[PDB]
């Protein structure tokens, strides 16, 4: 037996980082299957998932011992196209941080291709699998609909000052606070939708500060989580020493 | 079938009735051992490593202040050689050798065959030697984590910022594969100064070692397939290995008062006497146009003649520079004398035209010693030009700035300590 520990630290930030890593995240809002498909912009809502169409020479399944013992995901078994879910998260205590959305995906979802950047975080996977991931990425506490936004392009905003209404700037205006709720009426690449998708209320400033995986000097300073600073120094020192002589 | 008698650097019979196929790089055991040792042997310049460490210097001009580590290296050459052998060898008692030379300044390292057999190229001779000496010095002086990078720089130079060990202290008779002009040029990228230093300035052995390496290069290039195998082997035997004593006896006959032109006349007289050429037709003026009864054998006589003329002309002046003009005018005058193409059907003469230009102008090149079979100036002939350059460099009595004593002290000492490299004609003949 083995009980995963995930990450060091004892502050609310470290506790939230372990929640995102372990998948122990609270559900705070609901999105319908068709509204999720509409905002991802890969196919018409309600339509069946299209398949890949590879050349004749690649249709044959090879005799492979690994293919025989690794079960394909539902998306891989159906031959879905590879599609994506990309998020931008404010540095003003958006619950999510790019590395921790990638750790959440790597630990809790099969057959995923996560990518971490400062202003965007992506997960590519077989379309139906990426929608299962996408639903959890938007319904859970990993998202605040004001401090975060699905953006497959023109991502600028993670490090910008918030708007006067507390919403993170979006050059393409895909979602905004409209009459007491967050409305997303364009897909993740800015194409206007023929519907309004209601992403619900934003988190309060206090809730975001309590649920965030980002450290901030005016909330939970990075300097205050001694075990995390120690862990960094330990990895740096051991990598340095073993690079010279691995003993 | 083509047969030859192989004669020594002193014109003495060494082997009779030798099939030229048995002298091929692909069949001759001595040539295969020379190439095997060329690929597995590297030189570690302990003297260079010592000065680089003591002064924080990398190559000729780079110096990082505050990095001086005045480690005592040269005086510890035998202890370091023992540790380098332990690190370079694959198994105890295998074919690895490490020898101290030049009073501790150099190590000759011969990596075991196993490193070449599991590698694609010869470069493990450099990398295993460089890694071995770096580790041995770190151990002997208990060099700490912060300072080991300066031991690394003292051995490997600017690598990996540079493609090779630029400014380092581990080298070979060969240059890195990335410097090859095309496919099969590695054994052609060897300075004529290296050959002359290795063969102790014995002009016949300098031409022989160069001809062996050049023809190994021509074979690896794909220029000795089908009918071209006979073509290149006749050139190797007659120009490189003194077949039928033509090179030595022509030089002896023309040594006292001969010139480039009298060597041309001697070669035409000999080709006619041996039945290699005959009169084709006589012009109204009486000028005789000759025909080649055996084109490849005529080419080989012109290759032998090109070398004999170099020895007579450069030998008389005791000056290497005459080789570029000798290769040009021996072949130009040979064509004017007979109406037949010169060596390599104009390519020795053509190589000599550019070689003369690039050894007497502002644009590049240098003295004869810097040229090689991979040099853009001298690559054009199919291995028939550089053997003459190696002989010419050997015959120089002190006219050159960039002499073998200036450019080839390390290689000359390391590879010159191996008998097969010093005496290639004798070694080739004895392996038959």
């Amino acid at each position: 037996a083995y009980e995963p520990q995930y990450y060091p630290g004892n502050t609310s930030v470290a506790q939230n980082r372990r929640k995102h890593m372990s998948g122990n995240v609270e559900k705070l809002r609901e999105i319908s299957d068709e509204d999720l498909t509409a905002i991802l912009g890969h196919r018409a809502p309600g339509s069946d998932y299209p398949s890949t169409h590879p050349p004749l020479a690649e249709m044959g399944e090879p005799d492979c011992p690994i293919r025989e013992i690794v079960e394909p995901t539902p998306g891989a078994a159906a031959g879905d196209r590879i599609r994506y879910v990309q998020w931008t998260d404010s540095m003003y205590n958006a619950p999510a941080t790019p590395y921790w959305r990638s750790y959440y995906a790597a630990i809790n979802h099969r057959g995923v291709d996560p990518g971490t950047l400062s202003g965007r975080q992506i997960v590519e996977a077989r379309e139906r699998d990426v929608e299962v991931y996408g639903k959890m990425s938007i319904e859970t506490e990993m998202t605040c609909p004001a401090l975060a936004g699905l953006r497959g392009a023109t991502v600028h905003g993670h490090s910008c000052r918030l708007q006067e209404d507390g919403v993170m700037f979006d050059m393409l205006d895909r979602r905004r606070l409209e009459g007491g709720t967050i409305i997303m009426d364009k897909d993740q690449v800015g194409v206007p939708l023929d519907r309004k998708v209601d992403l619900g209320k934003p988190m309060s400033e206090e809730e975001a500060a309590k649920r965030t995986t980002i450290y901030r000097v005016d909330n939970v300073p990075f300097r205050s989580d001694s075990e995390v600073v120690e862990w960094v120094q330990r990895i740096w020192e051991l990598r340095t020493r073993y690079g010279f002589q691995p003993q | 079938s083509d047969k030859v008698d192989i004669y020594s650097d002193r014109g003495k019979l060494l082997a009779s009735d030798v099939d030229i196929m048995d002298l091929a790089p692909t069949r001759n055991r001595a040539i295969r051992t020379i190439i095997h040792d060329t690929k597995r042997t590297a030189a570690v310049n302990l003297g260079g490593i010592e000065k680089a460490l003591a002064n924080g210097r990398i190559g000729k001009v780079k110096k990082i202040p505050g990095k001086e580590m005045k480690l005592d290296i040269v005086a510890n050459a035998e202890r370091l050689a023992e540790r380098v052998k332990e690190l370079v060898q694959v198994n105890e008692g295998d074919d690895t050798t490490v020898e101290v030379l030049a009073g501790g300044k150099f190590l000759k390292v011969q990596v075991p065959s196993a490193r070449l057999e599991s590698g694609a190229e010869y470069v493990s001779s450099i990398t295993a030697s460089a890694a071995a000496i770096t580790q041995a010095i770190i151990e002997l002086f208990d060099v700490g984590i912060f300072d080991a990078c300066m031991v690394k720089a003292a051995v490997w130079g600017d690598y990996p910022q540079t493609i090779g060990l630029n400014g380092g202290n581990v080298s070979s008779i060969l240059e890195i594969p990335q410097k090859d002009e095309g496919l099969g040029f590695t054994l052609r990228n060897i300075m004529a100064n290296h050959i002359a230093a290795i063969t102790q300035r014995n002009a016949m052995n300098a031409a022989a070692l160069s001809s062996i390496l050049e023809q190994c290069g021509e074979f690896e290039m794909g220029n000795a397939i089908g009918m071209f195998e006979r073509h290149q082997l006749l050139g190797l035997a007659y120009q490189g290995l003194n077949a039928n004593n033509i090179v030595y006896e022509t030089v002896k006959e023309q040594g006292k008062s001969g010139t480039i032109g009298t060597v041309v006349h001697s070669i035409v007289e000999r080709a006619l006497e041996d039945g290699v050429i005959s009169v084709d037709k006589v012009a109204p003026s009486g000028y005789k146009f000759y025909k080649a009864n055996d084109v490849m054998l005529w080419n080989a006589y012109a290759a032998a003649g090109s070398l004999a003329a170099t020895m007579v002309n450069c030998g008389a002046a005791r000056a290497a520079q005459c080789v570029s003009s000798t290769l040009l005018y021996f072949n130009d005058l040979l064509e004017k004398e007979t109406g037949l193409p010169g060596c390599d059907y104009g390519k020795v003469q053509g190589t000599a035209v550019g070689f003369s230009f690039f050894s007497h102008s502002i644009y590049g090149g240098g003295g004869p010693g810097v040229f090689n079979g991979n040099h853009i100036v001298t690559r054009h002939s199919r291995g028939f030009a550089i053997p003459c350059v190696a002989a010419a460099v050997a015959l120089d009595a002190g006219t050159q700035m960039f002499s073998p004593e200036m450019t080839s002290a390390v290689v000359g000492t390391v590879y010159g300590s191996i008998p097969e490299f010093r005496e290639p004609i004798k070694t080739v003949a004895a392996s038959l």
Binding site: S159 | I64, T127, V151, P160, I163, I362, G364
Partner: protein, 564 residues
């Protein structure tokens, strides 16, 4: 309380109107996390309006369109967020970020041309050739005559043949050759018009250190025409130099104009006594010598000359960072290795708004107080851990205390380059060991990642995750002192936000020690020359001049051969 050095710049660039961005309506408080988004687009920016206007003229003239702000994704032009200017660090120049794009900045192009068009060629082996082969005497009189001939010939003018056609001197007036020597007796006899006087250019201690490293050797600092390297490439420089050195020796010493000894002078100038700016690159990113990829970090530190004229150690190291961030990220990675809009702001993060200055002065001042002074801290992992952690966490917190600072350096790679450069430079200056500084850079990168839950762009930290292990490795393609690393060091060959900062770290150990040079004393002396078009003692001031279209030493233009 220490007043952060960037606050003045943040007040100017965010709270004072620039163009028609209505800055006072966006926010007047540099600590406010909120701002009023006016979405002014093109209308707020005279610079974007200039580009839009030229785009209309171009489309009309060619019948094929070009620049059009409305072709931005969704038909929404740049400037939905407030467009702000930049203060070039250490200057009072305020400019648009477009004015710092290498294409739009003649000072930046001229800085690269002055490096590209330079090689250093020894004279000793050439003089020895003349003595050995011709029995010629070399004296200060023959050398001075040779230098007059050389400065006529080098730009492309004839000295031997009849009926030669020549370059227009007005197109090549940036081309010249100066000399320097470690032989003080020879230096006192060289014609002062051509001499780089080591005693005048460097302080007593540094001049002695240079002379001891150079010995009694003599060198030519050659600068071929900018128009030639622009028409051709960096690999042209050593060949162009050798051709005119060869002609000048022929004419000045009355040699035969093409004899065997001339080939020895050619081999000496092109190979044996040549000291270029960098060697070739491998097949995938193939280039010949004298290209940015071959320029070792220590060479860029020796090209820059701020340390020669200022005792402010942090300032001198950051002038190296500015030259390197521009050359390596904007020109090299942003054009030679990629292109398009490129990487202006990945580099400007390291030379604007006094931000890297604030972080570096903080770390260095902390180290001076704790360890005593420059080059006094032990070169150990304990010292690196202390200085780099202190400096990195201070820098991390500044982006959180100042939302305007975070919005200015909006990309994580910009924050990573600046946070880690300050940690590395403070560590290098304090220990006098640039390898200790490099170790500090990687520790700072790791701290930033865990602090913000993000680091740089997708591929930013390939070299940083490889980094800690490869600082002190002695393995074949891993080990190397930082001074000799460069853009061809495998881990460093692809990514922005590292190379220029590494040039500053390479300089830091040496600046901490008060060394005259970092890796090549010949390079240091060759660039200690006020006649060079770019002023290498004041890199940031020169970039600021180029930004406002006031840099007046741009070479290589063809106005003289074009219609009026």
């Amino acid at each position: 309380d220490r007043e952060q050095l960037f606050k003045k710049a943040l007040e100017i660039k965010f709270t004072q109107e620039w163009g028609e961005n209505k800055a006072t309506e966006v926010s007047t408080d540099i600590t406010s996390k909120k701002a009023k988004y006016l979405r002014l687009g093109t209308a707020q920016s005279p610079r974007k309006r200039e580009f839009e206007q030229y785009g209309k003229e171009i489309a009309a003239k060619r019948g094929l369109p070009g620049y059009d702000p409305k072709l931005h994704l969704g038909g929404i032009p740049l400037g939905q967020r407030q467009i702000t200017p930049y203060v070039v660090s250490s200057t009072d120049t305020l400019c648009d970020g477009d004015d710092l794009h290498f294409v739009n900045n003649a000072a930046m192009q001229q800085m690269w041309d002055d490096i590209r068009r330079t090689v250093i060629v020894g004279m000793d082996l050439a003089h020895e050739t003349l003595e050995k082969r011709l029995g010629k005497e070399v004296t200060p009189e023959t050398i001075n005559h040779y230098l007059e001939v050389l400065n006529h010939a080098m730009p492309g003018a004839a000295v031997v043949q009849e009926m030669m056609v020549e370059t227009h001197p007005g197109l090549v007036d940036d081309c010249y050759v100066k000399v320097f020597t470690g032989d003080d007796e020879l230096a006192d006899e060289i014609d002062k018009r051509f001499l780089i006087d080591i005693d005048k250019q460097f302080g007593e201690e540094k001049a002695a250190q240079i002379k001891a490293a150079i010995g009694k050797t003599t060198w030519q600092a050659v600068h071929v025409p900018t128009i030639v390297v622009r028409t051709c490439d960096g690999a042209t420089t050593s060949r162009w130099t050798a051709m005119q050195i060869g002609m000048s020796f022929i004419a000045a010493y009355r040699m035969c104009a093409g004899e065997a000894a001339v080939a020895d002078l050619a081999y000496a100038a092109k190979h044996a006594a040549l000291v270029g700016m960098g060697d070739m690159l491998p097949a995938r990113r193939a280039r010949g010598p004298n290209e940015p990829g071959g320029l070792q970090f220590g060479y860029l530190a020796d090209i820059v000359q701020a340390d020669r004229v200022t005792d402010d150690k942090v300032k001198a190291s950051l002038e190296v960072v500015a030259a390197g961030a521009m050359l390596y990220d904007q020109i090299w990675l942003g054009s030679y290795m990629s292109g398009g809009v490129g990487f202006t702001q990945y580099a400007t993060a390291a030379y604007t708004n006094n931000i890297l200055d604030d972080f570096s002065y903080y770390g260095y001042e902390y180290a001076v107080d704790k360890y005593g002074g420059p080059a006094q801290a032990p070169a150990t992992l304990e010292t690196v851990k202390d200085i780099a952690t202190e400096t990195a966490i201070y820098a991390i917190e500044q982006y959180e205390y100042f939302p305007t600072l975070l919005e200015d350096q909006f990309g994580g790679s910009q924050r990573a380059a600046v946070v880690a450069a300050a940690a590395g430079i403070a560590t290098g200056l304090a220990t006098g060991n640039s390898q200790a500084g490099l170790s500090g850079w990687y520790l700072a990168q790791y701290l930033l990642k865990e602090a913000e839950g993000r680091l740089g762009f997708f591929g930013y930290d390939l070299q940083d995750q490889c980094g800690a292990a490869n600082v002190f490795s002695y393995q074949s393609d891993e080990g190397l002192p930082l001074e000799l690393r460069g853009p061809n060091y495998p881990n460093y060959a692809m990514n922005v936000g590292h190379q220029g900062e590494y040039a500053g770290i390479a300089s830091s150990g040496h600046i901490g020690r008060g060394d005259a040079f970092v890796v090549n004393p010949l390079v240091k002396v060759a660039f200690a020359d006020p006649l060079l078009n770019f002023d290498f003692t004041q890199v940031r001031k020169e970039f600021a001049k180029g930004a406002v279209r006031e840099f007046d030493r741009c070479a290589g233009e063809r106005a003289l051969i074009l219609p009026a």
